Design a protein around this ligand. Sequence first.
Ligand code: HEM
Ligand code: HEM
Ligand SMILES: CN[C@H](C)Cc1cc(C#N)cc(OCc2ccc3c(C)cc(N)nc3c2)c1
Ligand SMILES: CN[C@H](C)Cc1cc(C#N)cc(OCc2ccc3c(C)cc(N)nc3c2)c1
Ligand SMILES: C[C@H](O)[C@H](O)[C@H]1CNc2nc(N)[nH]c(=O)c2N1
Ligand SMILES: C[C@H](O)[C@H](O)[C@H]1CNc2nc(N)[nH]c(=O)c2N1
Ligand SMILES: [Zn+2]
Lengths: 410, 411
Amino acid sequence: RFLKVKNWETDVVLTDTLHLKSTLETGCTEHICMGSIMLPDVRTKDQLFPLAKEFLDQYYSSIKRFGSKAHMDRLEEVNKEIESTSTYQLKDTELIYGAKHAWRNASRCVGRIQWSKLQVFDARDCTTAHGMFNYICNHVKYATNKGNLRSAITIFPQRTDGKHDFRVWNSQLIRYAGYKQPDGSTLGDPANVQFTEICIQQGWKAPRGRFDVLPLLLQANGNDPELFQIPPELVLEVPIRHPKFDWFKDLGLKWYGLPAVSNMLLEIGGLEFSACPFSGWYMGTEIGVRDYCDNSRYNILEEVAKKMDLDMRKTSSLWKDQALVEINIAVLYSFQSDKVTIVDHHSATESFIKHMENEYRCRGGCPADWVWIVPPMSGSITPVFHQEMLNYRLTPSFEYQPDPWNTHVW
Amino acid sequence: RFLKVKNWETDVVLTDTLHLKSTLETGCTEHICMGSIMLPVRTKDQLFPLAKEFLDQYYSSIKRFGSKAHMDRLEEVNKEIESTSTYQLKDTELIYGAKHAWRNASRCVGRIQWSKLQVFDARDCTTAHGMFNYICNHVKYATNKGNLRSAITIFPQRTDGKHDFRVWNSQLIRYAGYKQPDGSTLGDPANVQFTEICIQQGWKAPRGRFDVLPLLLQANGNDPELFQIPPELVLEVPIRHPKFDWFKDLGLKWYGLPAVSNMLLEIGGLEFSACPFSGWYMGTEIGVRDYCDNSRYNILEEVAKKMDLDMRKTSSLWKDQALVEINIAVLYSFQSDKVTIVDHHSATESFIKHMENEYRCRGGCPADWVWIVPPMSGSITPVFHQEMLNYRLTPSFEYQPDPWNTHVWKG
Ligand code: HEM
Ligand code: HEM
Ligand SMILES: CN[C@H](C)Cc1cc(C#N)cc(OCc2ccc3c(C)cc(N)nc3c2)c1
Ligand SMILES: CN[C@H](C)Cc1cc(C#N)cc(OCc2ccc3c(C)cc(N)nc3c2)c1
Ligand SMILES: C[C@H](O)[C@H](O)[C@H]1CNc2nc(N)[nH]c(=O)c2N1
Ligand SMILES: C[C@H](O)[C@H](O)[C@H]1CNc2nc(N)[nH]c(=O)c2N1
Ligand SMILES: [Zn+2]
């Protein structure tokens, strides 16, 4: 019940007790492990208060005022507001805490060593899509910082009862368009083909390129969503060149500097924030391995190897592997050359082990999802591969939520 | 209950019902997943239900469920248990059992081959010398001059746990590891502890970088004995690179036959503590883990140096570049010498086909993503995007403690 994890490269053994504070369930059972599954109605008054108490209890513990008048007062104060208004509002301090700890508890995020340096933008006074646009432009500009990226989250008003949901329909704030083409294949980004279309099907005029920055589709208070174009001057992009292959430039690749995920739900003390775009900076493999080389994406492997004139006749020449590496060397080279923040998978995984040992030390553990933490290339030469991890759900948290167009009462 | 898995690259969805036949536990609860944890004396009482379920499975597979042959065999096993407190498997049952232990191995990417296992019945074996003979024949048969063939050799089952047959080697063929006084390691760091035991037991070590370890064999609970595998039975492959002429000068080689010998085979409640089995290598086993793991031969740096890479910053990905070349060389050397090997692209593709086929005919295929995804280039192999369900079916291969931690020494 007081579990241990071993690192098999170093024989370091850490002891986990934090998992006992877990509440939400994993999807696994005694007879079956679902650890590789991608994805395994309002809160009532009786539902909401224990959730609020749990949260305030951990908040006042964290500021070392557990069992204080201030604690008991605030407990009292929220309990009465709940029975009154059937919901409650967080103080700014608790909002910031809640957001930082939702990143802290994100068992799938390799970048959590940075979790306490999160910039939190309170957008709970927002009322309109135009308002949302303004807040999102300010987020983008602040986070980008002329290439010196800074972590940030912007939090819009909380769900009241599903009727007045704030939603960012984009999956990220900045992403390239994906177009069906009569020929057969797909121009731009295949992952975004449906959304690219819903934009047009809403009224967007597409330049029909391969790297068209998508418009924002913003939903305030549950109204029909609205199209907004991000000022191009706010969208930092990196031309992709290779430090030894001149011909790499001629492939015509670029990517954006700011990874800003915008379709998730932030849960704090029972309250649900359906619109909460957050952003950090990229690990190189996210772009070079997944975005460029997933067959379901830009899938440029064949073309790169072709230009390297590798032997593509058989898989055992490992031409895919060889090209995959060059591609990722190039992504890192390009961002670094342009002084845009990026981290390689060796550096980030090493940072994460240090973060793990930190969390075990000062917190008694660190929920971690091996299947997502291990990078998508060169797994076993990174230190997290040989690191046993325990995965469990802590709150406050980031949660998945349905795509709006499947739900929204049009 | 029905359970679905999605391949996110192909949007193919499969439905698992086989998990319902799962008996053993995973280590996971509804509040904690132990999916990345490496590891998460039996009486007459619990044995007959274990036997019955096995025999029910066996006779279903041969389409004779509920037949007189089925019921008589049940009765026969029952009486033998009540009388002798254990029982013996028919040859047919053993063969079925061993194949299905492999079929059930959720961490094995090579299971498309499970039905083609060559099973050697060594249950008449009584001494260490006899064990050595059986194992030599296994090695010769399996190796087949480079044309590798899957095989398992099954020694007598546990009885009171005081008379175990054990192979003390983790694999039949492995290289020795020597700790030096200056803290360096000569050979395979993975085998320093076992090497030391051998030496204590009287092995005269050559003390080179690639010394094939002797067999340390334990029969019927007696003290283990040392034997040397005849060198002409040990097929080795010098490693060279197709474009890099300096690569051969690193002086590396590896053996052709992977043969795991420290696992326990469970069939119908019976425990076979010595059951060495072998197939053939996936390249990355050697080229990624054996050569490039920091706790192994760890040749990444030397290879990178000779490629003249930027080894200053890690973001130059000199490690990733060196790793690919080392793995190219491993595949190149084996194919050139006509020794059976499979690259991780071919193997993972085959496994997906196998997995789909298994859902169709069997209602599921238990699979451990953490182990199935290759240790390099994960997401450009099709298993990365494949959701999987992990559960435990019997017959099965299980882990067991190293014998030198449990053995009672005779003298
Ligand atoms: C600052 C540097 C950061 C790095 C390098 C980083 C890196 C990563 C990576 C590589 C993944 C794997 C996901 C994928 O492959 O698509 C991930 C997942 C995730 N990250 Fe981080 N991240 C960073 C910052 C943040 C921040 C600021 C937040 C929120 C405040 C966050 C929250 C998450 C969440 C919730 C997931 C998993 C979501 C899911 O279940 O799919 N990350 N991160
Ligand atoms: C014939 C070609 C085969 C290939 C290419 C293959 C491949 C692999 C690989 C790559 C692993 C991961 C192990 C690691 O990375 O340390 C594995 C695990 C495993 N294999 Fe296979 N294998 C083959 C044949 C067999 C046979 C013949 C058996 C048994 C009769 C078997 C039983 C197992 C078991 C029980 C494991 C799990 C070991 C553990 O849990 O630690 N395999 N296999
Ligand atoms: C094709 N695979 C899909 C896109 C998996 C995924 C789904 C969702 C959602 N909803 C959200 C996801 O976000 C992962 C994530 C979230 C935040 C990140 C930040 C802030 C930085 C960064 N470098 N990577 C992130 C990665 C991922
Ligand atoms: C340092 N990591 C350790 C060695 C993991 C491991 C432990 C054990 C045991 N006991 C058994 C193991 O077996 C894996 C295995 C088993 C059989 C294989 C066969 C038959 C062929 C092949 N190519 N690889 C195998 C790989 C692995
Ligand atoms: C900690 C982690 O579970 C451990 O290092 C596992 C991960 N996956 C693996 N996968 C394979 N094929 N072989 C291994 O030895 C391991 N080791
Ligand atoms: C099927 C599998 O769960 C799926 O492909 C997962 C595997 N691991 C991952 N790991 C990361 N970091 N990101 C991902 O999208 C995925 N996808
Ligand atoms: Zn699990």
